[PDB]
Every structure is written in structure tokens, then in C-alpha cells.
Amino acid sequence: CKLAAAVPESHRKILADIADEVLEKFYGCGSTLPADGSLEGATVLDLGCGTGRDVYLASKLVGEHGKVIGVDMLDNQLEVARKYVEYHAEKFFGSPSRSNVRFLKGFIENLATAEPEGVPDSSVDIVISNCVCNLSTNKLALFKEIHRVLRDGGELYFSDVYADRRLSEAAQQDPILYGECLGGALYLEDFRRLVAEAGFRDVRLVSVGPVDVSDPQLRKLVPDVQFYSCTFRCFKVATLEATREDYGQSATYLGGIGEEFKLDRFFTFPREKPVRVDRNTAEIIRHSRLHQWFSVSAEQQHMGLFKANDSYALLHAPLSMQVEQLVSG
Template sequence: MADTFGSKQTDVAVRDDVKDYYGKILKKTADLKSKACVPGAKPTRGYIRKALDELHPEVIARYYGCGLLVPECVAGCRVLDLGCGSGSDCYVLSRLVGQSGHVTGIDMTEEQLEVARKYMDYHTQRFGYKKPNVDFVQGYIETLREAGVEEASYDIIISNCVVNLSPDKASVLREAYRVLKNGGELYFSDVYSNARISESLRADKVLWGECLSGALWWEDLMRLAEEIGFTVPRLVSANIISIGNEQLEKILGDYKFASATYRLFKLSKNSEKKGCLVMYDGNIMGSEEKFEFDAKYTFKVCIKVVEVDGDTAEILKSSRFAEEFTFQPQPGCRAASGTCRAEPEVMLDPFKQAQQFGGVTVASSTGGCCGPQESCCE
């Protein structure tokens, strides 16, 4: 499987082109030539909108993400943002992790980091903190060690439409795995293709900068995750991308693209994966009635018990979500013998899932008592 662009010399050239594109060519969101790197259609929760309203306008103006990256249950966590840009996601998370948490943003583009650092004092004062709980580091997401990011030092890693810009995606995921704690999560939104992109298109600087020709074939994400040691990628949301540029569409031909958010977890190698019964306690901010974990599982307070497979059970028990659930043994379940009724997790095709919902997929109602248009406990 090709997970790098080519030689080290070629990889450096690609990184330099991306630095120029996002540092010198793009000055604001409106400068983008396609609709690939724009926010997705999934609605933003009220507490996140409130945090967004507190951000400085210049930080917002330099936003190039393909989906707002704010995972649930982040209070007190240490969070790393790969390719933080001007810091919009970092500052939202700075507000949500609180004074006891910490957020680090890393980016290779000096111009973007200059904007992010410029408003550290502004946001510290706006949030009412005694000291900053965010810092910004210049470096490459493929070589976090060289940037001084220590092993097993973060609870959560986010990345917002950045992995597709890297010529060496395997190194990005390996480094993310290295710096995550056991039970930690890589929660990232990115652009995926419906097939491997040809070498000729991968050489197009504009298409690469627009998050298209560097997109990973979604099936290759599954292979990389397994190779590195992550759990099966859990699809959270996806939408089909409309390029919105006839010239670029003609060049791309039959290739299709989707913006998708996945969860990958790092579990202890000695973890025992047994299916079990879980009850959601309803204490996650913004998810008091239901917690949309992924496109397979939505946990609802009105449902007393939900049966989950071994992978999901171990993720919930080992991660920051452990205190939000009550766990019960599943009678007669032996994961190794395959007698658990909950089906093992498989990676979902973002294109098929999005098409089922008219171009946008949201968390399913699995484990719930009602359909997608009904309130939780009717």
C-alpha cells in the first residue's frame, strides 16, 4: 500500500508547497478554490457555539477546516491539535478543557502560528483564566518527536482537514499513536477519496493544497490503523463533497470525495475485549439525553441497558468515557468464542453512509427507542 508520496526529497517539496499555499497564497477562508476544506453540515452544539462566539474575529477568518473538531467529555484533558493553523479549534478546546486542562497546537506554517500566538493573551483574559492553558509549537505532524512532543502525554489528539495534506500519512498516524496515552483517542476530520489517487493528480499543487489530490482512499485508513495498532476506525459523521469548481471537477474526472470524522483509540495491548451491557449516565455536557458515540452506537438515557461488542466495551472502559457509563457483565458472553450477540465493529464506508442520509450521515439510533426524527423518550 502506498502511504507516502514518494522519496524524502519529494515529500519535502510537497510540504514546502503546502506551507506556501497556506502561509502565502491563502489569507482567509474565502480564498479557497473548492468546497473541500469547509465545515461539514452536522449542527454545532450550543455550548460549542458559545465558545466560538468568544474567539477573536481574525482567528475565525483564517479557518480552513472541513469539520469543527470538538470531541465530547474534554474537561481537564490534555489535547494536541495536529495542524492547528491559526488556532480556532485550539481556542475552542481551551475554553472547554478549563484551567486544569491543556491544549497544544502544532503547525509547520509560520504565518498561521503568528496569528494563533498573537491572541493568546486575548483569549486567556476572555476565558477568565489566570494563565494560558494553550501553547503553539512549530513543527511537522510526521515528526512530533523532533518538535519535543513526549510519548504517552496526551488524552486526545484532534486533526482538522490536515492529514490529507501530509505526503506521509503512515508517519502521522504512528506519531499520533506514540504520543497518546493508553485509552487515548485520535478524533479527526479529513477528506477521503473513493479510490487511490493517481500519481499525476497527486503532483498537482493546487489540488493538493485544496485537500483533494492528497486525500487518502478510505479503505487505506483501515489498513493503516490496523498496522499501527489503533482500534477499528469508528465513523462519527460524513458528507459528500461538492467541489464547486468546474475546472477542478474536470481535472478530477470520476474521483469522488467525502469529508468524514473518525475516532481511533489506543488501547493497552493486554486489554481483554469482552462484550458487555452498558448504561449511559447522561452526565456529558451537551449530551445529557443521548451520547452519539459513532454511526453505530447512540447511547440514550431513556434506554436502561445497551449491549455492546468487545471492542466498544473496552474503549468505553479504558478511555475518558469510563466514568460516564455503568457496566454489567453480559451473561453467557465469551468474546473469544464468538458467542456475544453484539456484532464486532467494522469500518464503515463514508460514501455509502452519507448517501443513506441524502449526502450527510449522522450518528445512528442504534440502541435507542426511537427513530431519527423522534425525541429521545417519546
């Protein structure tokens, strides 16, 4: 995969404990994870888990009441993943039989028929993945399958490559672009309509990096296209609306999973300081696992669109203007 991202310090220690073979043969870049504290007790599913680097990492972070599932279709990668279950149970939880992980073989677009067992409806709290979408062009079925396995309050928390415009037919047929995850890149606005068709009505930017195309033969197929690496979080929450409405609410981060909670690029909550929120963000806080570390005030009368944020114009803007402006400048 990419050059991608720097490994956060809290993970470094845990990676030193992970079997060297799992690390050595792992395909692609690490799945990024929500703040570590927020994972305790969660059920996490990694799509495209490979040899299990991210599954084993999460295994420790979710603790013994948490559970982790990895899914993949590369036989060679799973055989490796499957045979370090005990290794890691001992090393994390003092015994070979106390494992909170499992590995499933199947296409990520169809988790219900993955091979030891399927993933049932409404059973996962967090689905993670890094750079898996641009390799299939049935993105839609993949988004609907993630919607299906998530419980209410669950999130798809993921990184992929997107484009600031629609690639040409020629760019989408190119095999070098394809294998770099560029050629299957969605236009951000098409991505937004598509995950909303799958049921995720609200997409929050966590971070964005520029992705460059340098080879001058390649650049000719995608001449003014700007590509981005975006981490988004998309919550499955029954009451989310298409718009960000002010109902007079504020939320207060109570402490206990960091100095401050960073929900997305528009909303940071310093410990014990109330922050005005739109009702979608109130509802995410309330119905997701995050409620344990927050206090959210009651809905008042509808006050119109939410403006009580210092980037409120960008907050309401299409996804490509958010990404474009938050990348740099």
C-alpha cells in the same frame, strides 16, 4: 478549506469571546470536537492549529484542570496564536497568567522536536485535526506520531477527505487536485490498513458528507471517484482486536454530558438504558475518559461475532461500505 460544517450552538458563545484577529486570520476549517462535556480535564492537541481558533475554543471547554496544545509550522499563524495567550486566560479564567494553552512550532509528523518543547510519549487524551493528511504523502509517520503521544484510552478524533477508490497517477500529480486535498486522498481501505499499521486497530465513523468535484477538467482526472468528508475516531487501547467480538457485555450511559451519548454511527446510549456492546466498544468505554459516565458489565464467555445491533452486517463490513451507505439512502 471546505464549506465544511455548521458551528454548534454551545460553541457560538465561546467564539464571540475569542480575539477577532485570531478568527479573522485563521487558515482553513474548524477542528470538530467530541461532545463538550467529555472534554473536561482532558489534554487536547490540535495538529495544524493555525492562529489557534480551535485551541482557544477547546481551552475553555477543557477547563482550568485541562490543557491545550497547538502545533503548526506557519510562522505568521503562530505569532498571532502566541500573542493572545493572556488575552484568553483573562477572558476564560479571570486572570492573564492562568492560561492552559501553548503553541509549538514544528512539522506535525515529528512532535518530539517541536520548538519550544517536544510532545512526550503518552501525554495527550484527544488529538484533533481537520484536513491535514492529504497534504503530506507520509501519512504513516503522521499516524505513528499520533499513536506515540496518545495515552492509553486516548483518541484521534478527526476529519479528512477520502476516496472510494485508488486515484490514478495523473490525479495524484495534479496541482489543483492536490491543493484541494483531493489529490492526496486515500482510498478508505488503504487508510484503514495504514492506521492499523500505525497501531489503531479499530476505526469508528462519527460522520460522513459527500465532497463533490465539479470543474470538468478536474473531473476528467477522477472520472468515477466519489470523495467523502469523514470524521473518524480511532482510540489507542491496548486490548482492542481486529474484530468485533461478543463477550456478553452491555454498557449503560449514566447521564451528565447530554441527553444521550453518541459514540459512533452504530452505538448510541440513551441515559440509563443498557445497550449490548462488542468487547472493543466495552474496552473503549472502560479505558478511555468516557468510563466516568458509563457502567460496563463484566465479560462472560465468548459468544462469537457481535450481532446484537440493528446494523450488525454493516458494522463488520469494510469501511467503504459503511461510509457509502451512511452518507445517504
